Design an enzyme around this catalytic site. Structure first.
Site, PDB file in Angstrom:
ATOM      1  N   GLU A 179       0.671  -1.235  -0.037  1.00  0.00           N
ATOM      2  CA  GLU A 179      -0.132  -0.125   0.121  1.00  0.00           C
ATOM      3  C   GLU A 179       0.369   0.933  -0.141  1.00  0.00           C
ATOM      4  O   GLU A 179       0.770   2.198  -0.686  1.00  0.00           O
ATOM      5  CB  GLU A 179      -0.750   0.015   1.179  1.00  0.00           C
ATOM      6  CG  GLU A 179      -1.989  -1.069   0.887  1.00  0.00           C
ATOM      7  CD  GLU A 179      -3.201  -0.975   0.330  1.00  0.00           C
ATOM      8  OE1 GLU A 179      -3.147  -0.210  -0.574  1.00  0.00           O
ATOM      9  OE2 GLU A 179      -3.801  -1.502  -0.330  1.00  0.00           O
ATOM     10  N   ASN A 215      -7.520   8.901  -5.942  1.00  0.00           N
ATOM     11  CA  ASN A 215      -8.330   7.552  -6.601  1.00  0.00           C
ATOM     12  C   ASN A 215      -9.087   8.601  -7.621  1.00  0.00           C
ATOM     13  O   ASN A 215      -9.842   9.654  -8.155  1.00  0.00           O
ATOM     14  CB  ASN A 215      -9.284   7.147  -5.465  1.00  0.00           C
ATOM     15  CG  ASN A 215      -8.688   6.192  -4.607  1.00  0.00           C
ATOM     16  OD1 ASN A 215      -7.602   6.096  -4.665  1.00  0.00           O
ATOM     17  ND2 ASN A 215      -9.430   6.619  -3.065  1.00  0.00           N
ATOM     18  N   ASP A 221     -12.664   8.650  -8.551  1.00  0.00           N
ATOM     19  CA  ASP A 221     -13.333   9.100  -8.091  1.00  0.00           C
ATOM     20  C   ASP A 221     -12.874  10.655  -7.082  1.00  0.00           C
ATOM     21  O   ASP A 221     -14.416  10.780  -6.715  1.00  0.00           O
ATOM     22  CB  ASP A 221     -14.264   8.037  -7.020  1.00  0.00           C
ATOM     23  CG  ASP A 221     -13.723   7.904  -5.765  1.00  0.00           C
ATOM     24  OD1 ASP A 221     -12.343   8.186  -5.555  1.00  0.00           O
ATOM     25  OD2 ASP A 221     -14.112   7.069  -5.664  1.00  0.00           O
ATOM     26  N   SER A 249     -11.815  11.030  -4.011  1.00  0.00           N
ATOM     27  CA  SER A 249     -11.221  10.839  -3.113  1.00  0.00           C
ATOM     28  C   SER A 249     -10.124  10.213  -3.234  1.00  0.00           C
ATOM     29  O   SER A 249      -9.276  10.194  -4.118  1.00  0.00           O
ATOM     30  CB  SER A 249     -12.307   9.038  -2.422  1.00  0.00           C
ATOM     31  OG  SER A 249     -11.199   8.044  -3.660  1.00  0.00           O
ATOM     32  N   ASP A 301      -6.421   8.159  -0.398  1.00  0.00           N
ATOM     33  CA  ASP A 301      -5.812   7.433   0.569  1.00  0.00           C
ATOM     34  C   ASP A 301      -4.900   7.861   1.219  1.00  0.00           C
ATOM     35  O   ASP A 301      -4.087   8.571   0.440  1.00  0.00           O
ATOM     36  CB  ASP A 301      -5.233   6.073  -0.029  1.00  0.00           C
ATOM     37  CG  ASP A 301      -6.149   5.119  -1.148  1.00  0.00           C
ATOM     38  OD1 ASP A 301      -7.627   5.906  -0.628  1.00  0.00           O
ATOM     39  OD2 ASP A 301      -6.733   3.732  -1.984  1.00  0.00           O
ATOM     40  N   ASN A 331      -8.743   5.080   2.919  1.00  0.00           N
ATOM     41  CA  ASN A 331      -9.329   6.375   2.001  1.00  0.00           C
ATOM     42  C   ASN A 331     -10.304   6.872   2.727  1.00  0.00           C
ATOM     43  O   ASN A 331     -11.431   6.916   3.480  1.00  0.00           O
ATOM     44  CB  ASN A 331     -10.307   4.968   1.062  1.00  0.00           C
ATOM     45  CG  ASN A 331     -10.927   5.913  -0.460  1.00  0.00           C
ATOM     46  OD1 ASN A 331     -10.643   6.271  -0.586  1.00  0.00           O
ATOM     47  ND2 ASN A 331     -11.011   4.946  -1.428  1.00  0.00           N
ATOM     48  N   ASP A 345     -15.328  -4.457   9.109  1.00  0.00           N
ATOM     49  CA  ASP A 345     -16.664  -3.999   8.582  1.00  0.00           C
ATOM     50  C   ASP A 345     -17.182  -5.350   7.266  1.00  0.00           C
ATOM     51  O   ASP A 345     -18.263  -5.152   7.258  1.00  0.00           O
ATOM     52  CB  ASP A 345     -15.981  -3.059   7.649  1.00  0.00           C
ATOM     53  CG  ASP A 345     -17.387  -2.687   6.938  1.00  0.00           C
ATOM     54  OD1 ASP A 345     -17.616  -1.826   7.917  1.00  0.00           O
ATOM     55  OD2 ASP A 345     -16.925  -2.130   5.823  1.00  0.00           O
TER      56      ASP A 345
END
Ligand SMILES: [Cl-]
Ligand SMILES: [Cl-]
Ligand SMILES: [Cl-]
Ligand SMILES: [Cl-]
Ligand code: NA
Length: 129
Positions: free
Chosen positions: A35, A46, A48, A50, A52, A59, A101
């Site tokens: 990562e 990202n 979209d 967003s 990280d 995110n 989650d």
């Protein structure tokens, strides 16, 4: 801060990540390797809109607030900048929520694609832990 491999393993253990939700320390170190290459200051945008953040590339779409991700949430209740600190506490606390989650460590696509199923113990080999 750019951690060494064993140094990060030790810090993760110190913060109770080893075998958290059944994921061994090598899984967590492997995820951090791919990562962020162990760099706490890593940020990546990202497609979209967003971003990280940090050692585990958490995110802003769901987990932290950066003020520029419309329609997103902040489920770790932290500014995304807190995930860039030399001290990994905030990233660890938030990662614990993420991995709880429902889909375990598959939440980290790099873990699924590069760590899952592999000899992850290699990542803590030789470490005084
Ligand atoms: Cl390494
Ligand atoms: Cl391991
Ligand atoms: Cl936002
Ligand atoms: Cl990947
Ligand atoms: Na957000």
């Amino acid at each position: 801060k750019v951690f060494g491999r064993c140094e990060l393993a030790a810090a993760m253990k110190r913060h109770g990540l080893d075998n958290y939700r059944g994921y061994s320390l090598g899984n967590w170190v492997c995820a951090a390797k791919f990562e962020s290459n162990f760099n706490t200051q890593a940020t990546n945008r990202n497609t979209d809109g967003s971003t990280d953040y940090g050692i585990l590339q958490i995110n802003s779409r769901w987990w932290c607030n950066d003020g520029r991700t419309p329609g997103s949430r902040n489920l770790c209740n932290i500014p995304c900048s807190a995930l860039l600190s030399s001290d990994i506490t905030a990233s660890v606390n938030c990662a614990k929520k993420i991995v709880s989650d429902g889909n375990g460590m598959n939440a980290w696509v790099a873990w699924r694609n590069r760590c899952k199923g592999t000899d992850v113990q290699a990542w803590i080999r030789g470490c005084r832990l």
